[PDB]
């Protein structure tokens, strides 16, 4: 008996099945480690989640588990296993086990220059994965390079469905969020495409006002139609108080980019969410012609829906629902 496993002064109780732990990353209420699975004889990714002190954290944990266990797609991360305590009174943490990928798009863009063919293939896989998510009437709401996992052969998977809802990181947030619909994910994909083209975030604001200023600095001052929606009074009056800003052509920001990539980028980074390109039209765009294949782009059989009103349930009821949902991965 070795006792419970530990990583950087905190318990990571995944043994005896998962051993030889190595720290990967950390979040506000969760740590990610790689581990050796002695059953499948392969290294896996394990996320420790400690959400029971807050109702919102419990909601996100339950939403992610239910969505990922239901979803089955090549470009979406699956859940292989879930570890938690034998009794609800002892359950203070939840460990989700997933495939261990090589890296993420955040790390790849920090150290590698991407060829147009690699940008095209990654964009294709993101939209193919998004086509499946959106067909299930689910919004990811937090697409960004760190949520895009890559294997050695350049295959891509979308992860982190904690903020997903039935129909976030500031730099990839759609202007209407700051001013939610399926179109908010297309914006985020637009921001990721622009980042793949230059290895730099296109709208790197320090705060929400600086974010809007970064967006207007490239798209130009918004029109009357762009602003007239169910917009926040302060945000509207602020945008109206700003001096005129000229639109910066895409070929001026990305002078060495493929003209087809910039035409698609234009349609994804449209201020008005109603005029923004939808996932099926984006896949069919001439930029993705080499990879577009509607015969091999699966969709969800039916739209996703939660049986209960998760927002209204007390954290103690959500703790019970998490215990019940994770019971199928327990022995017996
Ligand atoms: F729910 C889970 C369960 C296990 C891990 C995660 C998670 C959260 N953020 O990335 C991951 C990863 C899942 N599989 C992975 N494989 C590799 C990497 C990784 C990232 C950066 N450098 C190297 C490896 C991350 C993950 C997760 F969301």
- What atom in ligand 1 is closest to the CA of residue 46? 4
| Dihedral of the alpha carbons of 219, 221, 226, 232, in degrees to the nearest 10 | 110
Tokens found for residue 12 = 């990571």
Spatial neighbors of 243 by CB under 8 A, at least 6 apart, are none
Q: Which long-range contacts (CB under 8 A, 24 or more apart) does 231-240 make?
A: 231/179, 232/179, 235/178, 235/179, 236/179, 238/209, 238/212, 239/212
Extents of the domains making up the chain? 1-100+312-332, 101-311
Choose one of 49, 103, 104 to mutate for the ligand 1 pocket test, by most ligand atoms within 8 angstroms of C-beta. 104
SS3 sequence of the chain: CCCCCEECCEECCCCCCEEEEEEEEECCCEEEEEEEECCCCEEEEEEEECCCCCHHHHHHHHHHHHHHHHCCCCCECCCCEEECCCCCCCCCCEEEEEECCCEEHHHHHHHCCCCHHHHHHHHHHHHHHHHHHHHCCEECCCCCHHHEEECCCCCEEECCCCCCEECCCHHHCCHHHHCCCCHHHHHHHHHHHHHHHHCCCCCCCCCHHHHHHHHHHHHCCCCHHHHCCCCCHHHHHHHHHCCCCCCCCHHHHCCCCCHHHHHHHHHHCCCCCCCCCCHHHHHCCHHHCCCCCHHHCCCCCCCCCCCCCCCCCCHHHHHHHHHHHCHHHCCC
Query: Which CATH topology does 1-100+312-332 take?
Result: Phosphorylase Kinase; domain 1 (3.30.200)
Spatial neighbors of 94 by CB under 8 A, at least 6 apart, are 48, 49, 50, 51, 61, 82, 83, 84, 322, 326
| Ligand 1 pocket residue status of 103, Cβ below 6 Å | yes
| Ligand 1 pocket residue status of 5, Cβ below 6 Å | no
CATH number of 101-311: 1.10.510.10
The single residue of 142, 160, 185, 226 carrying the catalytic annotation is 142
Q: Is 332 annotated as a binding residue?
A: no
**Per-residue buried b or exposed e for 105-134, using 16+ beta carbons within 10 Å of the residue's own CB:** beebbeeeebeeeebbbbbbbbbbbbbbbb
| Ligand 1 pocket residue status of 104, Cβ below 6 Å | yes
């Amino acid at each position: 008996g070795a006792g419970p496993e530990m990583v950087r002064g905190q318990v990571f109780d995944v043994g005896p099945r998962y051993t030889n732990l190595s720290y990967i990353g950390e979040g506000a209420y969760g740590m990610v480690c790689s581990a050796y699975d002695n059953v499948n004889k392969v290294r896996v990714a394990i996320k420790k989640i400690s959400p029971f002190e807050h109702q919102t954290y419990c909601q996100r944990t339950l939403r992610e588990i239910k969505i990922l266990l239901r979803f089955r797609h090549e470009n979406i991360i699956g859940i292989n296993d879930i570890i938690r305590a034998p009794t609800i009174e002892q359950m203070k943490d939840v460990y989700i086990v997933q495939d261990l990928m090589e890296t993420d798009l955040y790390k790849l863009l920090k150290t590698q220059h991407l060829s147009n063919d690699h940008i095209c293939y990654f964009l294709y896989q993101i939209l193919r994965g998004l086509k499946y998510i959106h067909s299930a009437n689910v919004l990811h709401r937090d697409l960004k390079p760190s949520n895009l996992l890559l294997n050695t052969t350049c295959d891509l998977k979308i992860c982190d469905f904690g903020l997903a809802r039935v129909a976030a990181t500031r730099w990839y947030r759609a202007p209407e969020i700051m001013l939610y619909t399926k179109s908010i994910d297309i914006w985020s994909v637009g921001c990721i495409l622009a980042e793949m083209l230059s290895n730099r975030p296109i709208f790197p604001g320090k705060h929400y006002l600086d974010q809007l200023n970064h967006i207007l600095g490239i798209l130009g001052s918004p029109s009357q139609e762009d602003l007239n929606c169910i917009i926040n009074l302060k945000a509207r009056n602020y945008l109206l108080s700003l001096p005129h800003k000229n639109k910066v052509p895409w070929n001026r920001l990305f002078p060495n980019a493929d003209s087809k990539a910039l035409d698609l980028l234009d349609k994804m980074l449209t201020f008005n969410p109603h005029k923004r390109i939808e996932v099926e039209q984006a896949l069919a765009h001439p930029y993705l012609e080499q990879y577009y294949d509607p015969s091999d782009e699966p969709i969800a059989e039916a739209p996703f829906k939660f049986d209960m009103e998760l927002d209204d349930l007390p954290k103690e009821k959500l703790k019970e629902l998490i215990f019940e949902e994770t019971a199928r991965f327990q022995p017996g």
